[PDB]
Amino acid sequence: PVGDQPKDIELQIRELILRFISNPNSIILAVTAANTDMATSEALKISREVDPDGRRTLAVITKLDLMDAGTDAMDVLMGRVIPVKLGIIGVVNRSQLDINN
Amino acid sequence: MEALIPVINKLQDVFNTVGADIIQLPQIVVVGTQSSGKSSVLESLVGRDLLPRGTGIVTRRPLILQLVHVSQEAEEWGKFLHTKNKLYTDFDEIRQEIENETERISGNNKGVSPEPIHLKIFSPNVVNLTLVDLPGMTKVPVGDQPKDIELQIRELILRFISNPNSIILAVTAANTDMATSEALKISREVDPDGRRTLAVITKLDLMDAGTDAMDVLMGRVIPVKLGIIGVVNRSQLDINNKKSVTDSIRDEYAFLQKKYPSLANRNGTKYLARTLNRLLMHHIRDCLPELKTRINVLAAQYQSLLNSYGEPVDDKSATLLQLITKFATEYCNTIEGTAKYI
Amino acid sequence: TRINVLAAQYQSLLNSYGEPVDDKSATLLQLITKFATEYCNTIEGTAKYIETSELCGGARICYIFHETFGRTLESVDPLGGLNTIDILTAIRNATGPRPALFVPEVSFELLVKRQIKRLEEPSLRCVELVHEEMQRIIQHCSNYSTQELLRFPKLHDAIVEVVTCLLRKRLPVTNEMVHNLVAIELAYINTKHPDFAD
Amino acid sequence: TLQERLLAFERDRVTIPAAQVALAKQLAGDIALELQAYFRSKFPELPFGAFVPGGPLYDGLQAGAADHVRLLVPLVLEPGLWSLVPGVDTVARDPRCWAVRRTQLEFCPRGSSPWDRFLVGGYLSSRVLLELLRKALAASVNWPAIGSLLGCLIRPSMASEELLLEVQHERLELTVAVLVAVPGVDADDRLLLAWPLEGLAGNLWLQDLYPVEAARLRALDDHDAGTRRRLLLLLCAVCRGCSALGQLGRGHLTQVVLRLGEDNVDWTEEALGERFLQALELLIGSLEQASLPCHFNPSVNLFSSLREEEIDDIGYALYSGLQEPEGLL
Amino acid sequence: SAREQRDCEVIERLIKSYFLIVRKNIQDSVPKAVMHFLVNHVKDTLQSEL
Amino acid sequence: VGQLYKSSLLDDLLTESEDMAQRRKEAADMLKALQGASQIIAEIRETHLW
Ligand SMILES: Nc1nc2c(ncn2[C@@H]2O[C@H](COP(=O)(O)OP(=O)(O)CP(=O)(O)O)[C@@H](O)[C@H]2O)c(=O)[nH]1
Ligand SMILES: [Mg+2]
């Protein structure tokens, strides 16, 4: 809880997320950065609360260009670590500088 | 290392194209008593004066050297852990920075630090390799050293040589008694059989006149699984006189031919370098069946995937009729309750 | 005296390889023959190289066909999948659109087959395990004889490759047979079987 | 009476002949030592420690063949390269299971450790470890040499990672539960068991609090020379001699007795009957709620895997046990 | 020899016993193969064949 | 049969899923990589030349 956030801001945001992802009729985009541990993806962790099987959840790995050098997410991408019904797709995009440039 | 540069690169792609981890090369760790010639041995494996060198006590804080292969993406440069991404195209600065950093923790009064220095060296004509330059073995606590500095250094050595996946270079001076080589003595603590320990005899040119190490070299005194190889190198004067490699070779060769004619072509540093290359090639060979095994496993997996569709059907007519027949059959069977799919 | 002693030592070293082989043909055939002989003997358990070690070559396959395979099958079903209520549904389905005076034999005739189908997997696994062991025979074979084939390393490895090629050639053939064997059990149920009565 | 019956019941149903116990302990060591030697030659690359026999056979009185011989296989992970993570912290959100995280890859990259053969993503694979080690036991181990050496029939089970003594020449049969686990703690208690989770990530691990629970009951008894473990031993034999209690194992009884143990009542042998009925009452109440929270982890309902109706029927069976105490004995 | 004849009789018993086991299995094996490879096969193929 | 068994429909109705075709193509292409891994095996042989 930082700034003007409440003690349970984690749960507030969690419920704000659940407000939408709890609807079967939706596509859940589990966006997590490549240089973080995908196995702990909070995106997927909360997705499993409303879609434990991943039937309408797509795993998204961004910042592949920032991925920790020497490591990979091939096992995640290939479903060896994280099995996803809609598959796992990585993403490369603009940094602060590339947006500003 | 020479033709290994492209051989190994090809042997990286053998893993890259199957999704496997690339074989790691054993850590190169040099051991032995103070001023036996340890750092110099490592220097001969680089071609640059990257290490501190000298008599008495010099190395006072293990160096962790990471050789780095550079792609076609500064031609050659270094990088220290404690200076982040600072690039060192000045390789004298690198040596001096090791000296500086050594003094920062271990000090400048014979004190030895347990905190090693991490240095990466980059070039497009080198291959990824981890090496360790250790402080010499001692007995007496001198300067800033602790009562158990012998044991401290011993443990600092054991920290690296205790790893099976390493090459232990037992560097001991020719003019000392090889039978008491502390290098080998500590090597036997982690490698009692010498399976990954190579005996190195330096300063052959300083060997006590009238004596020899033929019995040591021939395994009569010291049996070594990787063999025993002698070394000739620059003294204080020859370093300060900038004796070239060619000059060193001439002196080494001529000396060895005059000293051990028959063993001269085994002691020859070039022979050693080729031997080391061979040892790495053997290290590679050890896991080529594992590589091939994966290839076989993957093939079964890919064929299993191909078995998911079976065929593309070049018959058409018969295929269609079969598909129709099977459907209608099971359809009618479903009506009966006699379907295969109950 | 030393000159004489050394000569014996150097000749002993020369005896480590014996000869450089100027015959080629006969030599190759002998090397092949000896390998294949001991290879087959290893299968039999009649090899000259009876080094006491891990069970391999011969009786290891006996182990596979009993301690592994036989036991594996013993763990399968025989009542697995038999949910009474689901079976009652199944026999209602077996009756189908008509009325019935009694339950159809179709019942167990299909339910048995489901269990029989489960016996195909571990059977094929057994085959694979043997295939592995057949390759392990080469590893065993490499503990001896090879020292002569070290004079022709290239040949040595070529031999190994050919052996495993042959093994792979005969692999799928056995697989087809085993598959068929299961299919045969699925093909027909003999309620007149001598051990089957109720 | 109940008191008298329990005392006889211990002698007649708890005690498993000392000759078999001693032989079992001998074989426990012998099997361990053989497997130590085997793993040294089969997995020289891996830092397996000395294997440790344990369980009821040692943990209590003459258990003998009444339950598995527990055999620890020590997965000596390289300190600093591996770290313990809660399963709930990952996408596979199961707090009961645990993960072993690979780290310090910036100084020690994958391929440098022998345990990196089990590295999937950035975690240690309990699954692959089990697959290889179970295969080793399944076929690789020369059980004909073991049987010949020890004078017995010993082979691998067809489930989990257990072994079977089909018969030691001296009229003994028993089973061995091989527990492959990371040493874990310097207390020599809590382990990271190579768990065989089928769902989620099969790479996940189980925090082994067995010896912790056993030590706790031991300590609780040693605090006042009580007989909490004696009650447990009685209850174990009751379950062995009662098919109605086939769904309630040693673990189930342990949780109940731990709850009982945390109390200040007459803990002497003279009140076995009293505490026996108390144990029934506590267990029955838990069964009536269809809930048994583990003493060292209340989020684990040990009755959650059982049918509610069967759970109640067990409580009813035990209730008739309360009505006729000696009928359980 | 007489002892050897007795040993032969043992062998004959082993032959008979094992043979009968084999034959018994064959009695079920063949029929099934015929049904599988011929009868049940053409039962389904014939339609597409015609 | 009367409706579906036409010579034109043998080209029309018998059209394969492209997604399926690509999936199996990739499996084949990975197998082609393992055909290329016979050159890895060639390299295995090459490492014995030193
Ligand atoms: N003549 C001669 N001198 C040598 C040889 N090898 C090393 N030296 C000399 O011995 C001294 C020690 O060399 P160095 O490589 O620094 O040894 P070291 O064992 O690393 C010293 P420390 O144990 O403190 O790290 C230097 O003065 C060097 O010139 C040799 O083969 N011949
Ligand atoms: Mg030095």
Short mmCIF file of C-alpha atoms in Angstrom, two decimals, chain B residues 220 292 296 335-342, chain C residues 2 90 93-97 106 110 114 161:
data_model
loop_
_atom_site.label_atom_id
_atom_site.label_comp_id
_atom_site.label_asym_id
_atom_site.label_seq_id
_atom_site.Cartn_x
_atom_site.Cartn_y
_atom_site.Cartn_z
CA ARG B 220 58.21 -43.15 -11.65
CA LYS B 292 22.71 -37.88 -30.03
CA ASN B 296 16.76 -39.67 -31.13
CA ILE B 335 -29.29 -46.01 -33.52
CA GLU B 336 -28.98 -49.65 -32.50
CA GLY B 337 -26.98 -48.85 -29.37
CA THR B 338 -24.21 -51.06 -30.76
CA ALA B 339 -21.74 -48.25 -31.49
CA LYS B 340 -18.07 -48.59 -30.59
CA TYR B 341 -18.34 -45.25 -28.81
CA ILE B 342 -20.38 -46.26 -25.77
CA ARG C 2 69.99 -52.12 -18.94
CA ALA C 90 -23.96 -49.11 -20.77
CA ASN C 93 -27.37 -48.44 -24.27
CA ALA C 94 -26.54 -51.98 -25.41
CA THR C 95 -30.26 -52.69 -25.53
CA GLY C 96 -30.84 -49.56 -27.56
CA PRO C 97 -34.19 -48.34 -28.96
CA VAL C 106 -22.77 -56.87 -25.40
CA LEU C 110 -17.41 -54.18 -24.75
CA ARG C 114 -11.94 -51.47 -22.77
CA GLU C 161 25.87 -47.44 -35.82
#
